[model samples]
Target: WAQSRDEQNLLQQKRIWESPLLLAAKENNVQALYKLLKFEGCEVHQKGAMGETALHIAALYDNNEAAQVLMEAAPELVFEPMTSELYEGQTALHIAVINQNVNLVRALLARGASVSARATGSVFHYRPHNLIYYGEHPLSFAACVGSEEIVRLLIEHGADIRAQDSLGNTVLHILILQPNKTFACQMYNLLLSYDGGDHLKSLELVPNNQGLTPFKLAGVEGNIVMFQHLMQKRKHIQWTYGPLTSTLYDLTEIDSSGDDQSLLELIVTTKKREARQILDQTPVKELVSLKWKRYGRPYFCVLGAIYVLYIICFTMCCVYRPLKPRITNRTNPRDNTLLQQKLLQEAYVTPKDDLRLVGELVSIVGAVIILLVEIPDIFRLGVTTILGGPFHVIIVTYAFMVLVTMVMRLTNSDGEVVPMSFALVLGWCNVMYFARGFQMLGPFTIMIQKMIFGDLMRFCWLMAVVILGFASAFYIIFQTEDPDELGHFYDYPMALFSTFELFLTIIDGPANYDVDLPFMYSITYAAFAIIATLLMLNLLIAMMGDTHWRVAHERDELWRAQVVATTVMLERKLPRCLWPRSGICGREYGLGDRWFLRVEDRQD
Candidate 1:
């Protein structure tokens, strides 16, 4: 009966450790694991139904401390056999990274875990589907999870990201298809971001007998964003399917029709009226239409005016042969000098500068005129024409006004020494030659006349001349510094011609059919004007604010580091104290010292 009782007791203790005690130890329950270790008749190395030993269970559940304790208690426990069902043939390290337990993963690796362990036994093999149901290595599992940290950790420990699963699914294939899984997107993004040739280059290699490619997977999943990002990094990808295919067909169909009539009909019929409205409202469309409408009209009536002016100027130069005055010609040297001195004085004068400043000011008046007069007229016209029509005119006028404001702001600040020679020539050319000839210049003449009629005429003209000079100087300087800077413009003549051509193109282009030129032009002009005037203008103020913030940050960091260092030093220098009744004393007293103190101080 005693022998029977001993057998029953042993069975009970064994069951206790095998069930909840084992589970608790797997969960890293320090007290439970210790109690189980101390339990009579308990076998620490006993394999569970899954063939996982205590250490394997601990590692699988990510109980690193339990794993460490088990390892110390029985070092051989770490080497215990894992069932073919658990890892195919992989070690504990494989399971750790797969579970995404960073600490257990590190512990196993530190203890010399194998990353390249291959499966030996084939428990569930099916040849018909070409599928192997055996558990994969650690790397394969890591890929399945799409955990970048674990993937990177495994790879660092020599686990391959390129390794294939039993059925031959690459890491890339697994990650792209696992869209619903956590960190899958991040891992795929990381893989795409990696610089090494091995990983990215491996994308081109054909998959096993399944005949699938990473590019195909990316396309079918509609990950166009990733596709585009990859295309930028690797130019020569074998794209099996993409938006490009549909886009090409759409473009080809449009080209075959020789008109976007279908698109226009779709726009009119579809609920995407906002897209159509936006298309109609773009600055590019408005500017283009304005260029076309103004073509042969007065605004850019340049070719005729230029030809006529050239003929007249040529005749005057040929007939008059204006007296060749020497540099030292003194008949009106005083007058010329006084005129130069007066021009210099006027250049420096606040009134002249203010007038130039007001050119931008008059732009506000022009905008108000458009908002009140032109915009209302646009509503009276059909929406299409309103979008496409008068857009160029508004943009040009608005841009001209902005140019005026910029010139004013650049010149208005004190200490700016306007170059006397450049200013005099530029001003004199505009005032004496261009001003009188404005009428002869036809449409060009009218625009200039209207500009001058605005309240700040002298300032407006001065600002205009200065802006032209600055543009010319910038072009020249940039040309010298980087000849290719004007590559888009092609050449100086082309550059100048392109400015007018661009306006014409915008006006006549097919894209104008959708634009609400007047509204868009007005809105864009107002927005940009506000930005240039308010937001960009505040940049200088923000710059000053940033400088102050940077200084403050540096000073604060220095003070914080000094305080931390001083505190640490003072803590080390402080002397220790003792007290039997105090909490601090109780904590400080060692076990042996406390025992001796208690014995010595006993009142009983």
Candidate 2:
């Protein structure tokens, strides 16, 4: 029957075409391979009955040029043959690695060959040959050949470092059993370097059949360098059970031979001990002293200045009346005739008028009070110190006296009673200003005390004065404004109460009159209730909205003045810039260029 079938023309033709082009390519029979490939009747990528392609066969023999030609002639031939029974699922990339041709491996990779192809070849079915023929990724093959360069290249190009062979040996486990310890160490380091948090943490969660971890594999191999490198680079090492055991047990099993200790032992026994000793003998006192010395002195100077200012202001208020009263008329229309006659007489009165006389008396009293308090501090500190120390106090006091005298002269005596509320308002305004000044100086004082005295007592004193001063000033300003206009407790001191009422009414109320007393009071009892509800709240919001606009206007004006002053200064210092080529004398010209020309150039 076979002889009869062979005699038939089509059967002979089928047998000739099915004959292995793969074997011819594997044996480096380039002419036979070429003739077989060029045969138009045969499929270019036709597999042998064993499922091997000509490209795979050429790679197996290190026939790279033949493979290239076959690839060029039929690029689709690069896909592994599916019909073959031998190399069933193997690809050109796997074949290149098996042949140990690094260049061919790289070429195949560049051509988009599969790096992670599975080995379904019949050769892998044989138990003994499985180690070499088993399912291995490109990285595994590189490690097997001890090719560190190929391994690194593959890794750099995104090859999986943690890939395992079909036999379930990871790349690291394969390297550990290799004879070349140096190359093994290099591979181990390479793997360690890539074992980021995810990889390390995953190793702990999933162990091998023997329950061995990657860290245990490192220890068992006695690769201390690899273990140390892994520990430093890998994250979640603290939570890793493998690293924890290795650290606690000092990896005693790996140190069983006694020739060399585990890396953990050296780290714990030698390095850590020395580090502890160094920390112990270090001069903590000297370090603290150095820190204080660097930051303390300036702090004391600032604190001293703040305290001096505070004392001077408080003393001035006690000794001198900084607020003065002046009568202002709310005319009674019924007394129009009397008022008109009085005004006519007052037009002829000189500085000797009764109102002017009373104002002069008040001014004299104010001056005497200021002189009594200011002269003593000035004498003790020296005149220069007094001038510099608390200039605000002296300026405000002198100005207050002058203003009172002027007001009195402006309104000659007509038995016009000054409103008591005006005096209270002025007094509170001064108090508010002084209080804000104290608040500003408080931080400066604390910083100073921290630097100079470095004692808790000074800090406490400064803080106490600041708190008291702020409380008193806020009370006067916010709580003591025009009582008749709004009532006593209408300004800053009662601001907190007003705030609470607002909060209750606006934020926490149900519009119930009984349970919400604060809300009710806020709506009805506030002296400026209608104005506060309608206008004051809206005014505050408007003020906040316009803050940037106001600031911008002030800033622009300030900068304009500064620029004008700078221009005038530069012109005076460098007049020669205005002159033509005739230099103002060598000295003048040199000075002018150094000052004026440089500034003008910068301006440009």
Candidate 3:
């Protein structure tokens, strides 16, 4: 009987923790909640099955009366969290804001409920397919929900606006990552106008764990509305009687000298068409050229010197070195052996030969070093990025060809001339990279790049289709014929070559296509000439002309983009420790870091 009695006491205490005080709050029964508060067995702090106390339920259910009474009975209940795994660390105030219950939240705040308590764990996060994710703060939830009343309530209650979630995303970061644009716009307006709104500008530059500020994140997500909203906020308007004097613009995303993450850095590497238009803005263009004059020129000198040394060494080895002919066609066996011995002796006999040997060794060393430096970027910036820019691709190809040429010479391979030819061509072609350092040549390079990738690529694609079609037709038409004029179209490979020749209009005379059926041969050849030569050549001219004209007008933006791209690449490759002590922070000219510019009037 004593054992049963002890069991009854334990059950009775369990009943107290999960008692009707919580039920009364769930039902919003004011009288029952008031009466249960007087009962000593009614524990208002105890949580229910959902890990929510009576106060949490009352706030969630918008039961203001029961919440009021519960707070009065135990003021500490407002700070208690739901102990369930899903809603872990969520206080009653989090429930109040999520419910959008205006009066209940006011009472919760009035009772001193914490406004900055994070709803930690995977509570709202563990939804199907990750549809919704709010920053864990109560204020972030209100901002994401677009509840102006609740958001104001939380902000006025001293909620930390800069409070970051577990992912380091602030309330503004949460708002922009969500799907609703107009809601974010309205919330943006609300946040900016709250309490004088001057200090809220810092929200744009707070970095997440990925180091993406809200400004950069907006561009990355392709949210132009949010992007422009932040852009507009970057301005300042002051009306002083009749004279209007605004402050200088914000340089948060424009300046990348001191910081690696900027909107310009993101736009130059990204493929988003609409976001790239931001580079065409006047402020961005001005800053890029300004930074070029300030920082880009110094860095360009270092890069140009290194590249020139590599090129000069490589050219010296290729031009001056003695080559051993791997195969000899001399009929006399003694003559062949004597010629091979002489060639081997000439390779390293004289002092000049020793100098040539030094050049070869230095060239090999430079090629290997350049190749080693570029290999890591394939993983860092990714393959698509390295391949997207022509400069990296050319340099990498040149380095590999240099390596192959050396290996062939060492092994006395029969194909030594092949890699050497490609190596020489690419090494000289890489001089084009230095053209970007000059204002006069930078836009010209961009124009050439545009034509090659834009007009030339399209031209080649269409040319391939036309050439292949004509090759098949000409092969079938002239299969049995053996005329000298039709000899080039003898087989499929020759058919392709002949069609290409027709495309280039490279011919001695009019093609003699007088087969047995003269009409069949004549009509097909005429059609191929008209379509492949006349139509394609004229179409290519028109396309190139259009691209040239468009690029000419926007030369400033294009040149600025090139300078910026070059500047970033050069800066990234340099020793990072040099930036801080080198004291080069984009036109900063003082003991500490700052930027200034002096401009002459245009009409003066």
Candidate 4:
């Protein structure tokens, strides 16, 4: 019976560490917490199921009195890290900064919490889909949340102003990437004021995974306020004497590091405004010194010639409609004479001579060679299984049309006449494919086609419906209360053309089809003109503009992908004999680091 009694006391005491002290701290029950703190073997360092201690609970709930009790009860527990549960390496101070509990953070610091702690894991847990490293530190999180008071508190309390996260992003880099001017600038000023900023300034210019410093990353969002604040910090540094001596750094880096012209052009395009005030301070000459390979003028000129030749061939095919065979009475000589004239005209094939056949064959082979290189790749990507992508559609369609035209030549019959409509498709898409290869020349068009237009294009399927709706509605509208300027729901294609013309110009094209019809049918025009023209068009423009504004900083990334991909294709075209014997000594810069899978442990 005495042995059983000893088990009961031991069971109750063991359970006490996991008990309601966290709850008491959470509820601001200071007396209950104090009583529990003195319970046998109830160290203040004991963590609850969520890996939070009494101090962590106290800080999370903003109960300063309960926090101070735990602080005084066992002061050594203040600096202890929160257990690895939800957030693996956060501590009481990390939570306080995250919660922006200014008083609690101050209370924590008085006991002994370090302001310089980086999270062992990020705000998001590591998973394959979320490919970033453990993110922001305590002060970094303070800046992340835009807590001005907490930011002020952390810096004054000896936080490492230059601390980096798993991503090698300094506190300033995190601040610039996260928020805007008013909140951001105040915190930046706090970061600047804490270390006279130059010690911190060296870290600010150090490139992160994408090879961008705080100054360059600020342009990612095109935040003018962040740019201005960054400029003021930069103005304090001397040109060559400062920590960022432009000459000493590796010059070949390509992720937004190129000639100053490249950077300036990206700024104007992505930000939509020049950050001249900030840019004026940097040594522009040094920025331009980095070397990059560019396509020669002759190759681009040849590409231009190919562009024009395709345009001519494609347009001619679309417009080439031959005369149909005419029916004639065997008995009538006048009909026979007219029949003779029509047969002669119909017999005249556009590319009649074998010389023209050679031209057709030349163009056909050119398209095929390009497609031969292109098709296996398209198939490997599995994008060509359906009629998708500019190259897939344009090359195949033009190749088949040439085959069909050649068959027409050998047979010489009206039965072989090609449909003129395919000409239009092959024409436009071919131009799109032509320009897609030149990144520096056509990023505006290429990005709109690939990036800015996905959602808008998905919604664009309604265009056929809208056009049909207008064509069907106007079929009735053209004849309502008729002055009978027109008859039939008539001749479909030309009727749509007339209605579309009337819709566009809002003019009376109808002496043939009078507007002597009822004006309510005219009301059909107003309703559709507003829906298809005014509303949908403007909505498309707004969505494109909004997407660009949101993803502009990523524009350079997209453009680089375009440039490198095209360069590889062009490089493949060169023969091994034509390649340099000196081993293609391409100028190299850029950190050969995994922008992911890399987060160096902060030594401090």
Candidate 5:
């Protein structure tokens, strides 16, 4: 059978060289081609120079009339492949797309051409040898040629929207690499506008050989406009009730597990502020909760435990630190001083045992571990992001102060007091980084953060102006040549501090009535109290309450963002081996690209 088939193909190959049917179609003479095909002895299935049928030559030459006539005669020619080395696998449809002949393309599709045909020939491959290459399909060729009408025609006729090129790049990936941004943007939206359910979502998640989905490719190219377009495509408003809205999203892009990289990872690892802004979307935040409940929470909980342990170790070392002996003076003496003097008689400049050394090593090692983990974050996220996060500042301060304390211990440094004190405070405060792992504590952490950065910061700004003005005014008013009559405003620093205390009503304004200019002092003090204490302080408290109320409404989403950012930062930095494996159980519910969620509305 094989030999007979081969002999028949050879017979037709010889007949094609002198066939008038191919000659008429090759010359684009439709009347002559139709007349030639009407006879029985004239073979319509014979190939010419490149093993292409008459339909292939007609498509290549934009001969719509010849193509329709040839298709009607031998409809099988629509699927025949060119047998040459350069265009070996491409059919008539591919040739039409290559030449950008829209009329021939529509005629071929109307005659039932194969849209999913793969042009798997050598020329279609992305090699150094081939200067021009389309991604090995009719759809890919149409995309590369930058013809919107032709692409739409192919897609409308059921072309594989998820078709991959020889290089594993999808149609979306090919369009993204287009030099024409405006054309690419329009084509991107055109592809997405098709009414295929989940097809649009799936196309963006299909990664090329370079491990970039079209969404990730947009991010890698720093095309934030296209990135945001991809983001809008993923989000859907399912329903709304009263002032509340419920939305649905395809999690295929934002979700990541033990090994697969995700959109969340790409955005978090990016240094561009605009790219990172998409994390604020509802789908991205929901993905955070999804990963959290699946695997993120348990790992983060263990991380929280380790952080608190580090804090405990630091506190213990600070508490057990050796103290210098006190020298008693006639100005103040106490029984505690006698006890300390007795204890100092056996003054050991260093610790007696290795216990303190062990504690110091553990504490310093913890600090070094945390600092090393966070250093890459600073480089990836940059100083602007670091400055915005409260926990980032605390961790940086705690680590540096711990290092300073370590250096002081080795040098027997005299001023170990300041570094030790700061390290202790900041070390404990750094525990708030783990607050995002808890349901109740996470939103509360957000609330306090909003208050501190927003309301409290504004209060400080207003108070600075109020305090400076009052302090200078009071200093001049109460200035006296005699030290006895100087009062609290004798010096500028003293005046500044006293004005702050007066704002808190900690000092008596009546005592300042005996100053040189009692009228000036009293009126200035009244102005300070009204502006600082009455107006600015109460205004700050009101603002704090408003912030708490506003944040309370979106507390769920706020904490989800916090947890997602925390997870992305830590998960990306963890070694693949150390990553906790995601379990396959309890995930039987999800389909290929969708998992159903049943959300219940609250009611009275």
Candidate 6:
């Protein structure tokens, strides 16, 4: 039956692959691996059924001496890609890492294996079923198995301690996900000790795909020790809160949600004195410093020009999308660009002057192009370009809106006015994009922050409180008398706005009540008017005067921080080849990386 099956299938069904050298390595038979290497036709590059070569197996099985033999004979194995069933595509360096072959790992690194290279595969692996998340760099694997020595070696060799897995998880994140009571804190302290720049602590601040920061996860896991370590350096780390994660462990936020599980609430309830101790500490500026950039002035000038181009591209694409080329005349074809050529050659049904379909197709093509340009920036921002980079955030927002609009428009059974509202929202979202894009400009950033944390916000909150107080008074005052002066309060919930307006009138001058009306009602209106004008309104005036002095100081640093964030974000968008640590410039260790400094040329 086997013979018949083999004959019927021939080459297609037969599974004959890989040199005996790999099998020998897998078997840890050093004698056979050496003998196999001596053959005239054999090369160390030969891959087996699992897409792994002899050295890969040698590393996996911890055959250190044999692995060195393979490396010494053909050292090219260090840089070679190992694609196999045991894990996703990995290098021999990564192979030695997960299996804890210390000598082999060192050998791979000594032979110039990349410390920062990431595996292009799923973190979840499969031998029989699965056991570990294995898709990131070797350092993450070292952390996973709680190997302090391996972790120490990797960090010392200039592996980016800030490096994260595909899920936006750093080594700290990996430690948080898996608990190893013994070696966990050791690895954690080792990683923390290498905080050479804002970048390393930056990693600890990054939330995982599950929206769990090192601190947040520590809180979730009930690890007070881990929390203490993070708290030690929390001031320098860059972290923020969001709707996706609970605010239970967020140190900086003081939420009024009244939720018992919230971090602020917990601190107040659990450690009241500690909360007071921390509450008065000044919030430090958390922006990544511009001095961290290694590029010279000329390079930054070019980058500035490139950002201008980015602005132009996004603006034209969103605002003037009609500028996109189309086969306006279906009968005619102009292969001016690759896309138009592809549509003419490969598309099944040629679309005509149908703006509806044409526009959607164009935006999809536009989004794809933008996505390629943005991929590097995502990792550059902790795979967080979608969250932190406002420019990227805007593109995604507009692109998402465009896709949804196309879907709803195409699916309409009745052309109602509802979908038209979506177009208005798209306009609004883009308008905000334009506003925020200018946040790199100091005045604009200050102007925007003034809205967020300045007098504008204070004024809004005060008005809201004022409205609530007067509206309730309006409701009570008019229940029996049904006074026309207190207009909205004459009804249940309807005329609250009208009553609030009457209160406005009364506050400015005398109460507009009937002279013959109940004197008590007039007295109540007069009392509310006097209190609102003399006390509430004047009180806000004093608050505003004080806020004006504070907001100016706040805006200065806020502007600096926003500008720094914008600059770093722009730097990230540049090709990684320009990054000194990517080793495209040279394999300078990131901790001590600096390419050049032509400081005398600076106008500042």
* TM-score top scorer: 3
lDDT of 4 by residue, 234-257 (tens): 332214433333222222221232
Question: What would you estimate as the lDDT of candidate 3?
Answer: 0.68
Per-prediction TM-score, please? 0.32, 0.33, 0.62, 0.51, 0.54, 0.37
In terms of lDDT, model 4 sits at: 0.55
lDDT of 1 by residue, 1-604 (tens): 3554356446534653658756676567887667667876466666655455667667666778877887667776545555745234646665566567887777666667667665433432323342333235666566566566776777777766566666565666655544443455556667544425665456535453354455434433444444343333332222334333211111111111222222222222233223233222222123223323332134223433553443333233223211223434455755535321112212444644454444435434543543554444443433210122233343334434434433633535332224322322332232222222123332333233333443235343443443243234333433443333222233556434433333223323112334333343345335433543345445535744555455553333332222222222222223335111111122244322121111011122
The positional error of residue 397 in candidate 1, measured at the CA in angstroms, is 74
What is each predicted model's overall lDDT from 0 to 1?
A: 0.43, 0.45, 0.68, 0.55, 0.68, 0.53
TM-score winner, 2 or 4: 4
What's the TM for model 3? 0.62
Could you give candidate 3's per-residue lDDT for residues 1-604 as a string of tens digits?
Answer: 3554356446544553457666666778887666665755565456566566777767766788777776777788777787766578888877777778788777777778677787884546624545688778888888888888888877778888778788777777778777898888899768756533466457666788778788777776667778778776554333333443433344545565455565667776765555555654535556556656766687687778887877888787777656556455764766525444214422446666787787878878777887888886664544321223676777788888878877766647443667778878778777787887686877777677777777898888888888888788877776767746446677889888877877888865235545455456578778876887778798788878877877685665656656677766655667755643221343443323443222222221
Prediction-by-prediction clash tally: 14, 14, 1, 1, 0, 5
Q: Give the range where candidate 4 is weakest over 10 consecutive residues by summed lDDT.
A: 594-603
Worst 10 residues of 6 by lDDT: 594-603
Stretches > 4 Å off in candidate 1: 1-21, 35-41, 75-81, 84-87, 118-135, 143-146, 180-185, 192-203, 220-229, 234-604
- In model 5, the clashing pairs are none
Q: Model 1: what TM-score? A: 0.32
The CA root-mean-square deviation of candidate 1, after full C-alpha superposition on the true structure, stands at 33.0
Ranking the candidates on TM-score from highest down gives 3, 5, 4, 6, 2, 1
lDDT per residue (tens digit) for residues 4-65 in model 6 = 42453343122222345555666677776666668654665765554656677677667898
lDDT of 2 by residue, 421-539 (tens): 23333433333222211324333332322233333353435444433433343344435334444432355544444344542245342234333233323434343334444454454
lDDT of 3 at 270: 68
